[PDB]
Design an enzyme around this catalytic site. Structure first.
Site, PDB file in Angstrom:
ATOM      1  N   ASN A  89       5.946  12.387  -0.534  1.00 54.80           N
ATOM      2  CA  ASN A  89       5.822  12.287   0.930  1.00 54.80           C
ATOM      3  C   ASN A  89       6.837  13.164   1.468  1.00 54.80           C
ATOM      4  O   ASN A  89       7.552  12.384   2.311  1.00 54.80           O
ATOM      5  CB  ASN A  89       5.935  10.757   1.069  1.00 54.80           C
ATOM      6  CG  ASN A  89       5.475   9.653   0.605  1.00 54.80           C
ATOM      7  OD1 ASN A  89       4.194  10.132  -0.232  1.00 54.80           O
ATOM      8  ND2 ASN A  89       5.560   8.435   0.725  1.00 54.80           N
ATOM      9  N   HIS A 102       6.627  -2.962  -3.831  1.00 51.34           N
ATOM     10  CA  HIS A 102       6.161  -1.710  -4.195  1.00 51.34           C
ATOM     11  C   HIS A 102       5.108  -1.781  -5.309  1.00 51.34           C
ATOM     12  O   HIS A 102       3.843  -1.313  -5.300  1.00 51.34           O
ATOM     13  CB  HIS A 102       6.982  -0.731  -4.148  1.00 51.34           C
ATOM     14  CG  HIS A 102       6.612   0.695  -4.170  1.00 51.34           C
ATOM     15  ND1 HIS A 102       6.111   1.449  -5.270  1.00 51.34           N
ATOM     16  CD2 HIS A 102       6.798   1.669  -3.263  1.00 51.34           C
ATOM     17  CE1 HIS A 102       5.937   2.780  -4.993  1.00 51.34           C
ATOM     18  NE2 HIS A 102       6.260   2.821  -3.733  1.00 51.34           N
ATOM     19  N   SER A 120       2.119   7.217  -2.946  1.00 54.30           N
ATOM     20  CA  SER A 120       2.041   6.279  -3.942  1.00 54.30           C
ATOM     21  C   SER A 120       1.222   5.393  -3.920  1.00 54.30           C
ATOM     22  O   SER A 120       0.914   4.431  -4.943  1.00 54.30           O
ATOM     23  CB  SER A 120       3.414   5.288  -3.690  1.00 54.30           C
ATOM     24  OG  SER A 120       4.778   5.943  -3.650  1.00 54.30           O
ATOM     25  N   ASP A 176       7.165   1.397 -12.045  1.00 52.01           N
ATOM     26  CA  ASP A 176       7.358   1.247 -10.909  1.00 52.01           C
ATOM     27  C   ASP A 176       8.562   0.229 -10.481  1.00 52.01           C
ATOM     28  O   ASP A 176       9.213  -0.253 -11.327  1.00 52.01           O
ATOM     29  CB  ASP A 176       6.099   0.607  -9.987  1.00 52.01           C
ATOM     30  CG  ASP A 176       5.999   1.141  -8.564  1.00 52.01           C
ATOM     31  OD1 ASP A 176       5.137   1.929  -8.337  1.00 52.01           O
ATOM     32  OD2 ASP A 176       6.844   0.741  -7.631  1.00 52.01           O
TER      33      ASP A 176
END
Ligand code: NA
EC number: 3.4.21.62
Length: 266
Positions: free
Chosen positions: A146, A64, A212, A32
């Site tokens: 998404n 994130h 996520s 990430d």
């Protein structure tokens, strides 16, 4: 104080935790945007950055990865975390970087890879990376994306889209698929991903929504299963995971359903 996403209870982790298993000795690479290792409720065991402008994989400029990483920890508190930074501060990264972080996981003997990231285009080399990781025995999990729906088209991104990856869609507290969750035949299982509370950079907590957020529950889950059955292969881990989900709505939208870790761990 702190928060533990509600998905920890929802996927039934507490029962594992109560059986004594918590992800102990399982290596999880969180591919990430880095992980703020300076967080108190977060212990990072190692990692590496493939973002050239951002050389410190333990510095997270986005939030994130810290979040996603705190979710794995919430599901499997004793798992060993590796921050593999492939997403820079804007939240985006090259495919090249991603393969690089993926090749780093294989090479560092990760047991679990979590990729709460995705792109609209295939890459044969990204496809080869994930295939090789799985062939090397790593359990690979990714966000399913998404992108909502688009008629009959699969809106599953890459790498979630490859058959060697376990693509995770998102449900909310009542197991209803989230409006944004990608769909398509490659969606495999679901996990909570709506307003999931987790760690943030600077002794913080915050909620976020996204596949996520769902992905890391499934990755912390594979880590619980491993800690109970360290001789299981990835293939075994993954199968148990898909085979014991709580069925929800149709497969195009929910996949096999929601994961049930107590059951998966057998
Ligand atoms: Na898939």
């Amino acid at each position: 104080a702190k928060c533990v996403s509600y998905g920890v209870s929802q996927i039934k982790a507490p029962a594992l935790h109560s059986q004594g298993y918590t992800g102990s000795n399982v290596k999880v690479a969180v591919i990430d945007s880095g992980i703020d290792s300076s967080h108190p409720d977060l212990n990072v065991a190692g990692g590496a950055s493939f973002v050239p402008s951002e050389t410190n994989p333990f510095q997270d400029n986005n939030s994130h990865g810290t979040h996603v990483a705190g979710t794995v920890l919430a599901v499997a508190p004793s798992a060993s975390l590796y921050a593999v930074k492939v997403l820079g501060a804007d939240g985006s990264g090259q495919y090249s970087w991603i393969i690089n972080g993926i090749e780093w996981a294989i090479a560092n003997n990760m047991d679990v890879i979590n990729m709460s990231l995705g792109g609209p285009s295939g890459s044969a080399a990204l496809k080869a990376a994930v295939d090789k990781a799985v062939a090397s025995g790593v359990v690979v999990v990714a966000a399913a994306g998404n992108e909502g729906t688009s008629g009959s088209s699969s809106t599953v991104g890459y790498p979630g889209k490859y058959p060697s990856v376990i693509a995770v869609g998102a449900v909310d507290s009542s197991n209803q698929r989230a409006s944004f969750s990608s769909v398509g035949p490659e969606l495999d299982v679901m996990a909570p991903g709506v307003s999931i509370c987790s760690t943030l950079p600077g002794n913080k907590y915050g909620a976020k929504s996204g596949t996520s957020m769902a992905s890391p529950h499934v990755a912390g889950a594979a880590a619980l299963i491993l800690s109970k059955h360290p001789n299981w292969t990835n293939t075994q881990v993954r199968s148990s995971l898909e085979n014991t989900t709580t069925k929800l709505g149709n497969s195009f939208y929910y996949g096999k359903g929601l994961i049930n870790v107590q059951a998966a761990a057998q």
